[PDB]
Ligand binder design. Structure first.
Ligand SMILES: Cc1ccccc1C(=O)O
Length: 518
């Protein structure tokens, strides 16, 4: 793969790629579609609009939007202007967004109507610098000074040229949380999504122009941003976008061509989703779908789910691993070489090392900490030099995973270095779940660990010491956590215990809870 030039604006790159196919559909959702020409026009009109309201090159804007055709307009339009969109998870709290507004010093916000109430609370509470709120598909009346996204875009002529950025200039941020502390601003450059899209999208997956891409993973996830924006636009594929929560039924409707007159050929999702669909009584038959490639990430794929999928559809599930910091997948099975029980082989262009307790070598078959050297690495966590030092170790990026290398050169997952769980395809901190449980007045103590379910997928499990003299039922606790945690964070079970295993300092011995001592 040829490196991108030094003068490179990633948005311009994707637009120029598709000037050969102006009338092909670029994006379609439940209510709208954009051809590549339409996407270009709206992108460049947005870029002008953000400049007209005073947002300058290198300044941030918050992009808080459901998957839909306005999403790539927002993302690429900022980047075309040389403005840095901060693309964020749509299921967070107003407090999370308040922190992000302050930390990013976002100058404007692009927000879905459905997300305007949480955003409004974030604005009200924070010491932000937001000059304008631009609302895509408003669900309530606009407040004074707010603007409808379609009017904002429509009222401005297209920007005539892109910002003259460098390949290594920041292009956009994603946020990533660790087991404690605030979300970290992962800073990606213009070059980074070129590299993922070429090394993985084109050269590993072999995506092509006649593909229709559909990702259960939303656009704000690094995984989904590649799958459903950077990858398809690199090759000229059409992409289907869905605003709603993925369920088996929602995914099947789309697989069957229920939206936009298109049937996906490439699907992407998490192993939990694949398990859910395979359990669904109305799982479509092979002859009803146009799938040629199924990608998986977000948690280790249990071999049985891949094997069952292949028995049913005649398609393997291609499981790979990436990180937010590396932008996309660097270690993967291949469409024509799958070894279930493994994450496959290093992606050409990326070097992988396993390091032991001193940074030393680990013998094949022994677990080490995974480090990656490749050209799509983020540069830093913005404003966090200490965590930057820990993760970005001189050309090598630490992922937080442990792995074993097998005799065939494949790699098998061996857990985390940082207490995080990967549940339903998403990172969740046990300490967050514990923090929520102990605020119930009936709970004295709580410890949360990962447990494999009947399909071998990790789900949280809570061990709770009740407070003497209160009452506390499992169902009381279910109701308490309902609206305090996202549903993927719900413990799959709660065990009430009289005490937890601890050191003499009171540190919970979590390892004993995984080993079944209770
Ligand atoms: C965390 C992540 C980011 C980009 C692509 C894949 C992954 C993963 O979940 O393995």
């Amino acid at each position: 793969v040829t490196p991108p030039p030094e003068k490179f604006n990633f948005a311009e790159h994707l637009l120029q790629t598709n000037r050969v196919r102006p009338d092909k559909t670029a994006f379609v959702d439940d209510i709208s579609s954009l051809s590549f020409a339409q996407l270009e026009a709206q992108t460049r009109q947005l870029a002008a609009a953000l400049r007209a309201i005073g947002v300058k090159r290198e300044e941030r804007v918050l992009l808080l939007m459901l998957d839909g055709t306005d999403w790539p307009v927002a993302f690429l339009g900022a980047i075309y202007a040389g403005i840095v969109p901060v693309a964020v998870n749509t299921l967070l709290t107003a407090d999370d967004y308040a922190y992000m507004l302050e930390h990013s010093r976002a100058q404007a916000v692009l927000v879905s109507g459905a997300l305007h109430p949480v955003l409004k609370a974030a604005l009200t509470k924070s010491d932000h610098e937001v000059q304008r709120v631009i609302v895509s598909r408003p669900a309530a009346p606009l407040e004074p000074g707010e603007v409808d996204f379609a009017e904002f875009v429509g009222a401005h002529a297209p920007l005539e040229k892109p910002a003259a950025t460098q390949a290594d200039d920041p292009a956009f941020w994603l946020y990533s949380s660790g087991s404690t502390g605030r979300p970290k601003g992962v800073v990606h450059t213009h070059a980074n999504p070129y590299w993922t899209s070429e090394l993985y999208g084109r050269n590993t997956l072999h995506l092509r122009e006649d593909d229709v891409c559909f990702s259960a993973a939303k656009l704000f996830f690094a995984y989904g941003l590649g799958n459903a924006l950077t990858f398809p636009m690199t090759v000229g594929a059409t992409t289907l976008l869905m605003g709603e929560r993925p369920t088996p039924d929602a995914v099947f409707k789309r697989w069957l061509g229920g939206v936009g007159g298109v049937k996906p050929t490439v699907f992407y999702g998490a192993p939990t989703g694949y398990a859910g669909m395979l359990a669904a009584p109305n799982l479509p038959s092979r002859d009803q779908v146009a799938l040629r490639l199924a990608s998986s990430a977000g948690e280790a794929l249990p071999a049985e789910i891949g094997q069952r999928f292949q028995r049913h559809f005649g398609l393997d599930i291609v499981d790979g691993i990436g990180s937010t910091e590396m932008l996309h997948i660097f270690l993967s099975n291949l469409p024509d070489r799958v070894r279930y029980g493994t994450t496959g082989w290093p992606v050409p262009g990326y070097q992988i090392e396993l390091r032991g307790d001193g940074g030393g070598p680990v013998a094949d078959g022994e677990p080490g900490d995974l480090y990656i050297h490749g050209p799509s690495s983020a540069t830093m966590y913005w404003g966090n030099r200490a965590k930057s030092r820990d993760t970005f170790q001189g050309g090598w990026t630490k992922s937080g995973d442990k792995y074993v290398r097998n005799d065939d050169g494949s790699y098998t997952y061996a857990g985390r270095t940082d207490d995080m769980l990967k549940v339903s395809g998403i990172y969740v901190s046990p300490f967050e779940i514990e923090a929520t449980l102990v605020q119930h007045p009936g709970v004295l103590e709580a410890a949360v660990v990962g447990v494999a379910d009947e399909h071998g997928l990790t789900k949280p499990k809570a061990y709770v010491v009740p407070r003497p003299g209160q009452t506390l039922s499992e169902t009381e606790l279910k109701t308490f956590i309902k609206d305090r945690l996202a549903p993927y964070k719900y413990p799959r079970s709660t065990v009430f215990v009289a005490e937890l295993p601890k050191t003499a300092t009171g540190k919970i011995q979590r390892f004993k809870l995984r080993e079944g001592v209770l």
